[PDB]
Design a binder for this molecule. Structure first.
Ligand SMILES: [Zn+2]
Ligand SMILES: [Zn+2]
Lengths: 549, 98, 370, 463, 109
């Protein structure tokens, strides 16, 4: 009867908890959690009380879990990797540095297989992938010696890269494909050897796979990069999430479809085709979703459960092959980042506020009447706000057309149809008289011949250039500029403006004087550096016009 | 400007909607047409407008004398117009009939 | 305007030339209170013989099966302007066809006012409403205790325009619709129409009680027609004018040409002994000087044992012979009729001297061997 | 409310926790917790569990001071606290910070034990942390330290308190002033001191690098945005005396600022367009949680205690959207209507996308417009001074611009949204070439302009 | 290549009989009647004339005359000419029993 329920919420910062880092992991009703602080939490999933609380040093960056071995691996940021016996003889507990193994310190990201550990180590520019044994007998929980390192030569530097395990059928914390796909992506080597393969997405968005049978090397026997790591598709944004998906749904599920995500939301589904050549080709799409995407998961039957920062949204891929677009719902759950999926679908979270919460998915007399009362009121709430948005849409639309007349005017002027039809401005000279003295005025007529009504946003500049030939002594006044807003000009309609050009100082007027008239359109005015200025006429006032008889 | 000889597009004045000090104050801090008329003796106006230029006795000749000082009197002499709608210094319209 | 400098702008406001050489337009196109994405590339010249045009998926869905239409239009439209005209016309069509998807109603009026007005009626009356709240169907009671139904179809604005009214009874229904008129007004009108044809219904009631009505079965309130069988293997069809029901009807006779004569003659004799104070049957019994049988056979009354295309027995020695392999149809046919039916349909497929193809009435596999 | 029998409420992970001191007779008063939850089947609040705490000393004047969540510094875990005063009539006031866990059981942490009565700005914060005042003297008792401490700086009113990235803790009381609550004392990009007259409560919401996208509200019943103290998007509030805001989210984009007022009233206002969406009255209290298990915040309105001498009668819970819940067939009508509501929802959410698409093309089109007309930085940089009744604008050129070959000018253009009027705007253009340590070698060519002030200063301001 | 299905292909099945029937030479009109009595006898005793009367007026696109001229034709002019002439016969035959709203839309065409 509560399709969503709360367990415990945490010390957030402002905004709330960022992405990459935090992790949730459910065991049976044992549950595990990194809030991307130094602290990993353990909850009784029946009763949202805490069993077990752990302090590490420095900011936990990722978890995994081996159920057989009853162990948890926990990456501290600038330290190496600390492993915990789950029985583990205040409910707060520091780790001792004993539980430390491979303090490599320079390691971002790691995964598990069976008896194998795969780390990914930051360096200088070249990231290299390392690989260690992991002791299959219940022993001291050891690394062993490194089998394998290579350079992700492809990779040259907030966003923590991620790795994945992909084992084919017959041969555990990963994904099995169907042998058709497995074969299509990686190829024969991989298929033959029943090699579990590891996919690294990287902050660039680059999604590289590596074949773990093939990563065995020594000082006398180094990794070649180009052999050994290969590069599948390059999303141009950081990678949040990889999985595989059982489309065609007709515990070890044999998936058919490989799923990637970006951050800004290019997602990438991949499938088997075998089409049109009787030959295997991989169906690619690169759909282009909403939002920053901020965690993802896979749940029963071709359904991805993902976050925007708005809302918790979900996609279907189930039903050519896969699909034209993934147009996509929420379920009206807020931004949880840090999601997971256990299959019975019942998925679990940490809410971007700070919240640990568990989503379960799938006539009376007169309180039918109260139902009606309420339902109208709901629509009475919505409708207002719909309407709001239309009016906004009006402003937007009117503006485009408002712009559209701008593009049309601009284009007509930049064309030489050989007569400056659309807008013209004439200038012409007029001896006035002031206080005593005869003065020279230049009348500046703007005339609209064309249809186009020079709306608000438009504005006229005139510039009054003295003599040209820049001097030894820089004059007092190089030139003057006058500038006016044009309003609503209309077709046919006109403005005139007269200036001074004439002497106050010296009785001193020297020629040629030129007056170039021009137009700016203001983009902002209707609501990178931004306007457009457009060049109308350019008239020379010479010694002939300034004569008077 | 409506009566004006050229019938050429001159922009309409619409002088400033507020004072700059007034705009300043409003921003920092957050109908019938009025009439007057006169009547006057035709005999007085006759005897005075005699030196009688030409033209229709009264109303039009009254107008020629009330705008005798205005430059745009000889245009109203030609069109012999007894009622016109001028503008002002403060941009408002004002309609005067005789 | 004449030119597509100004006519274009005036007819496609929201299509902006990105490019100076007015070759790429992009933005929105308007249609029916609804503005939609459009991305319309030209080549180096202003030629639609080669042009790119993509949609949002929202538009392509809405120009479902006009795709080939619009490709043709692009090759055979002269101008961009006329092409936009054609396109907007073409949207208007699409949406006016699929009007079942495309309401936002004006809730503040709509859904509330409907509850108001239905409240004014009373809550017993409504029987069906479709969940688009388009169709509502209402119930009315005769003085005679007979149920008659009324469909209303409602538009986007119910109270502005007439509701479309669909009803059974046989004379053309008239509803004085004002913007001030409402459901109670059309309700009153409907009750008026019931009480008016009251006599016609008492007459049809009387017939369907006392007699072996044959050819309409569970007859609607629509029907004016009542094919009575009488004695056995002879029948009379009686069509009655609703305004003057009691008045003599046009009546005529099916069965044995030998048995039809004397009845057809005695009718001729006794027709002036019709009277509109007694019932149709109380005039017919004393006009034709007979009684009718009171359901002489109620189970095998009659199965139209007829072609179900031509509605005749004996087409050129062929009998209704050819049948359906179905319990729910069992409709006979003729070889010739059914061959000329199924061969015309697109669904049916032809083997050597056999046609497998859909029974006309029930659309189930039926086989014809010539 | 605040007394020996009187209670307070609060919210915590869907549920509404009821703290009630109760005079026990054998003894002194006891804290009794009811942790209650909304059934949805029965449309009421059902007790889900209880907790008690036995108080020792046979003294009166026991008093709740406030209740909220916090997040403890040891664990990280939002816990409901309570602050109790114990007054012995000794001119002594204890002030306990007591925490309740999962277990419907408590833990005392600070006794804190003053002699003078505590009042004004008591606000409890992250590392369970009590900060108060008398006569313009701020003090704080962290639960790490255990000891009374004084705030170094001298401030009037202390509007905001709370943790941020890189700092740990902060106080904003004078908007310039930007403290620590470790080493008592960037102030750079806060709201203007122009606001400092009229602001009476604040509420940040987002922070980056320093930049604080923040809200206020004023004595004048306003409500304001700021992105680096840039006052955008003002609303107006219907009642007077606007105390505080919260936030609520309510599903996609429906984000509201739910404001409590001193006149026993409240509003919500619709961020997306600063608009009052709704107004309520008499509001004994308000809390903001997903009381349903939908996954979107709702809001609870409690109505007055005159009705019954009981708390959670007269209540009302809503989204301001799909949910409104509260205290002759008709049925064939419902699946129409419900289905109806749901379609408009699809319409809201779809127009919302629609609008943004429009915006994006518009933007697409200016940039199209700007490349329609058409890299090398010809001009360094703009500056300006005021000389008396003279606006003097200038700039610095680079090498690229040869004044030998190009007559150049420098106009100004006013913004018409201010300038309703045709005043023509003039400016005078000078070239200034200055030789730079002549004792290759640097010439400084600068172009600059002038015009008058009091023409522009019509609207207190322009751009 | 040049398959077109009949214009009434998409319609509710009993229309599809009515107009399938009226395709067939001058006794089309009885066959129309035959159908009406044969659907008073099947389980939808009514036949929703307001369905069919909309469908007739609603227009669709055609490109005829040259290879290139776009037009909007209603159903009535688009469907088989003998089905026209008999429809129209049948509608004098059941005029009383149709609503006016539809009829007038038909006629105007
Ligand atoms: Zn036949
Ligand atoms: Zn059949």
């Amino acid at each position: 009867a509560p399709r969503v329920r709360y367990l415990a919420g945490f010390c957030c910062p402002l905004g709330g908890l960022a992405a990459g880092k935090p992790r949730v992991l459910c065991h049976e009703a044992e549950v595990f959690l990194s809030t991307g602080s130094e602290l990993v939490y353990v909850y009784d999933q029946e009763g949202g009380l805490l069993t077990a609380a752990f302090r590490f040093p420095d900011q936990v960056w990722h978890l995994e879990l081996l159920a057989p071995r009853r162990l948890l691996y926990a990456l501290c940021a600038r330290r190496g990797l600390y492993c915990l016996s789950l029985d583990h003889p205040s409910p707060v507990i520091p780790v001792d540095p004993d539980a430390c193994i491979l303090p490599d310190a320079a390691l971002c990201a790691f995964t598990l297989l069976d008896s194998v550990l795969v780390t990914l180590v930051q360096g200088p520019a070249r990231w290299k992938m390392q690989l260690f044994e992991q002791p299959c007998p219940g022993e001291d929980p050891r690394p062993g010696g490194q089998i394998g390192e290579v350079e992700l030569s492809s990779y040259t530097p907030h966003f923590l890269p991620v790795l994945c395990s992909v084992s084919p059928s017959g041969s555990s914390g990963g994904f099995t494909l169907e042998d058709a796909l497995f074969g299509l992506l990686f190829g024969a080597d991989a298929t033959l050897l029943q090699s579990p393969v590891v996919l690294c997405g990287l902050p660039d968005g680059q999604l590289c796979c590596v074949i773990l049978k093939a990563l065995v090397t020594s000082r006398s026997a180094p990794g070649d990069p180009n052999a050994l790591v290969k590069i599948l598709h390059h999303l141009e944004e950081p990678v949040i999430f990889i999985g595989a998906l059982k489309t065609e749904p007709q515990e070890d599920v044999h998936c058919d479809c490989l799923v990637a995500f970006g951050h800004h939301g290019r997602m990438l589904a991949i499938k088997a085709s075998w089409d049109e050549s009787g030959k295997l080709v991989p169906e690619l799409r690169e759909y282009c979703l909403p939002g920053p995407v901020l965690c993802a998961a896979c749940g029963g039957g071709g359904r991805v459960y993902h976050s925007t920062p708005s809302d918790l949204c979900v996609v279907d891929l189930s039903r050519q092959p896969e699909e034209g677009p993934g147009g996509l719902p929420p379920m009206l759950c807020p931004a949880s980042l840090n999601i997971c999926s256990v299959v019975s679908t019942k998925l679990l979270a940490l809410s971007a506020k700070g919240r640990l919460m568990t989503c379960s998915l799938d006539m009376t007399t007169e309180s039918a009447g109260q139902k009606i009362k309420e339902l109208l009121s709901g629509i009475g709430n919505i409708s207002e706000r719909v309407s709001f948005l239309k009016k906004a849409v009006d402003q937007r639309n009117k503006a485009l057309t408002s712009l559209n007349e701008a593009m049309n005017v601009s284009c007509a002027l930049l064309s030489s149809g050989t007569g400056p039809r659309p807008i013209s401005c004439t200038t012409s000279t007029t001896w006035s008289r002031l206080q005593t003295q005869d003065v020279l005025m230049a009348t500046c007529v703007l005339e609209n011949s064309s249809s186009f009504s020079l709306d608000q946003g438009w504005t006229l500049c005139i510039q009054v250039l003295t003599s040209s030939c820049a001097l030894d002594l820089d004059s007092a006044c190089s030139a003057i500029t006058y500038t006016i807003p044009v309003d609503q000009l209309g077709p046919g309609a006109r403005r005139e403006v007269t200036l001074p050009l004439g002497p106050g100082e010296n009785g001193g007027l020297d020629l040629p004087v030129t007056v170039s008239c021009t137009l700016f359109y203001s983009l902002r005015e209707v609501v990178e550096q931004e306007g457009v200025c457009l060049p109308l006429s350019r008239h020379t006032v010479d010694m002939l016009q300034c004569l008077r008889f | 400007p409506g009566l004006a000889p050229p019938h050429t597009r001159a922009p309409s004045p619409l002088g400033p909607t507020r004072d700059p000090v007034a705009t300043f104050l409003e921003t920092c801090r957050e109908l019938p047409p009025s009439v007057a008329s006169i009547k006057v003796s035709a005999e007085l106006l006759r005897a005075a407008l005699k030196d009688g230029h030409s033209g229709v006795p009264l109303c039009c000749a009254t107008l020629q004398w009330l705008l005798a000082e205005n430059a745009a009197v000889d245009v109203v002499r030609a069109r012999a117009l007894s009622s016109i709608q001028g503008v002002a210094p403060d941009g408002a319209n004002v309609h005067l009939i005789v | 305007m004449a030119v597509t400098e100004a006519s274009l702008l005036r007819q496609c406001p929201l299509l902006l030339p990105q490019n100076r050489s007015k070759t790429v337009y992009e933005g929105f196109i308007s249609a029916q209170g609804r503005d939609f994405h459009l991305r319309i590339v030209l080549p180096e010249d202003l030629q639609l013989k080669n042009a790119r045009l993509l949609c949002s998926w929202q538009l392509r869905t809405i120009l479902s099966g006009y795709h080939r239409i619009v490709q043709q239009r692009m090759q055979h439209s002269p101008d961009l302007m006329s092409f936009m005209m054609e396109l907007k016309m073409l949207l208007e069509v699409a949406l006016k066809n699929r009007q079942e998807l495309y309401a936002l109603p004006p809730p503040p009026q709509f859904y509330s006012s409907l509850i108001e007005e239905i409240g004014t009626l009373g809550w017993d009356k409504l029987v069906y409403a479709d969940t688009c709240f388009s169709t509502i169907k209402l119930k009315a009671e005769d003085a005679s205790g007979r149920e008659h139904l009324i469909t209303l179809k409602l538009k986007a604005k119910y109270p502005a325009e007439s509701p479309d009214y669909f009803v059974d009874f046989p004379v053309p229904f008239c509803a004085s619709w004002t913007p001030q008129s409402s459901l109670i007004s059309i309700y009153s009108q409907f009750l008026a129409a019931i009480e008016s044809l009251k006599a016609f219904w008492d007459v049809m009631d009387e017939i369907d009680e006392k007699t072996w009505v044959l050819e309409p079965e569970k007859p609607p309130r629509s029907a004016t027609a009542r094919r009575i069988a009488l004695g056995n293997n002879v029948s009379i069809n009686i069509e009655v004018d609703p305004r003057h029901p009691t008045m003599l009807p046009e009546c005529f006779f099916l069965g044995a040409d030998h048995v039809v004569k004397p009845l057809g003659i005695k009718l001729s004799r006794n027709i002036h002994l019709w009277d509109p104070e007694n019932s149709v049957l109380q005039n017919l019994k004393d006009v034709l000087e007979i009684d009718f049988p009171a359901r002489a056979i109620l189970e095998k009354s009659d199965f139209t044992m007829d072609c179900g295309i031509c509605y005749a027995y004996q087409l050129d020695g062929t009998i209704p012979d050819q049948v359906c392999d179905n319990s729910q149809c069992g409709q006979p046919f003729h070889q010739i009729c059914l061959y000329e039916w199924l061969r015309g349909l697109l669904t049916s497929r032809q083997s050597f001297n056999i046609i497998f193809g859909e029974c006309p009435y029930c659309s189930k596999p039926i086989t014809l061997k010539m | 409310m605040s007394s020996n029998e009187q209670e307070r409420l609060l919210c915590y992970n869907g549920e509404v926790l009821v703290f009630q001191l109760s005079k026990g007779n054998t003894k002194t008063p006891i804290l009794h917790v009811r942790r209650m939850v909304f059934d949805r089947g029965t449309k009421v609040f059902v007790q889900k569990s209880t907790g008690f705490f036995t108080i020792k000393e046979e003294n009166s004047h026991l008093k709740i001071m406030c209740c909220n969540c916090v997040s403890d510094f040891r664990t990280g875990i939002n816990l409901p606290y309570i602050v109790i005063e114990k007054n012995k009539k000794n001119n002594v006031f204890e002030y306990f910070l007591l925490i309740l866990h999962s277990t419907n059981k408590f833990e005392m942490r600070l006794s804190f034990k003053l002699g003078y009565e505590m009042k004004d700005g008591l606000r409890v914060l992250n590392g369970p942390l009590i900060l108060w005042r008398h006569v313009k003297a701020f003090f704080f008792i962290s639960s790490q330290t255990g000891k009374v401490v004084s705030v170094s700086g001298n401030f009037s009113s202390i509007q905001w308190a709370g943790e941020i990235e890189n700092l740990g803790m902060v106080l904003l009381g004078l908007k310039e002033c930007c403290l620590s609550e470790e080493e008592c004392t960037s102030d750079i990009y806060i709201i203007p001191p122009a606001y400092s007259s009229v602001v009476t409560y604040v509420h940040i919401c987002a922070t980056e690098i320093l930049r604080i996208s923040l809200i206020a509200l004023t004595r004048k019943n306003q409500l304001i945005s700021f992105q680096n103290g840039t006052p955008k998007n003002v609303c107006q509030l219907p009642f007077g005396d606007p105390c505080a805001v919260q936030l609520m989210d309510s599903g996609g984009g429906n984000l509201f600022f739910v404001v409590s007022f001193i006149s026993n009233n409240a509003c919500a206002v619709w961020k997306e367009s600063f608009q009052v969406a709704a107004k309520w009255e008499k509001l004994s209290l308000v809390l903001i949680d997903d009381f349903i298990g939908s996954g979107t915040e709702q809001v609870l309105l409690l109505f007055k205690d005159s009705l019954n001498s009981d708390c959670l009668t007269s209540f009302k819970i809503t989204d301001l959207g799909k949910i409104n819940y509260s205290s002759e067939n008709r049925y064939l009508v419902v699946p129409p209507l419900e289905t109806g509501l749901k379609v408009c929802f699809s319409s809201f959410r779809e127009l919302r996308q629609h609008l943004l698409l429009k915006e994006k093309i518009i933007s697409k089109s200016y940039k199209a417009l700007i490349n329609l007309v058409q890299s090398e930085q010809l001009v360094e940089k703009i500056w300006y001074r005021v000389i008396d009744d003279s606006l003097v604008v200038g700039v610095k050129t680079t090498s690229s611009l040869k004044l030998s070959l190009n007559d150049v000018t420098l106009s100004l253009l006013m913004d018409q949204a201010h300038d309703s009027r045709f005043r023509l705007l003039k400016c005078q253009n000078r070239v200034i070439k200055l030789s730079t340590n002549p004792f290759k070698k640097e010439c400084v060519q600068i172009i600059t302009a002038v015009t008058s002030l009091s023409p522009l200063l019509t609207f207190s301001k322009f751009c | 290549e040049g398959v077109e299905p009949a214009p009434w292909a998409q319609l509710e099945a009993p229309a599809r009989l009515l107009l399938q029937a009226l395709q067939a030479g001058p006794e089309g009109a009885r066959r129309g009647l035959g159908v009406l009595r044969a659907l008073g006898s099947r389980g939808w005793e009514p036949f929703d004339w307001g369905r069919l009367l909309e469908a007739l007026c609603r227009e669709e696109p055609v490109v005829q005359g040259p290879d290139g001229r776009l037009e909007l034709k209603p159903l009535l002019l688009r469907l088989p000419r003998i089905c026209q002439r008999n429809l129209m016969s049948l509608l004098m035959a059941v005029r009383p029993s149709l609503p006016e709203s539809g009829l007038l839309s038909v006629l105007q065409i």
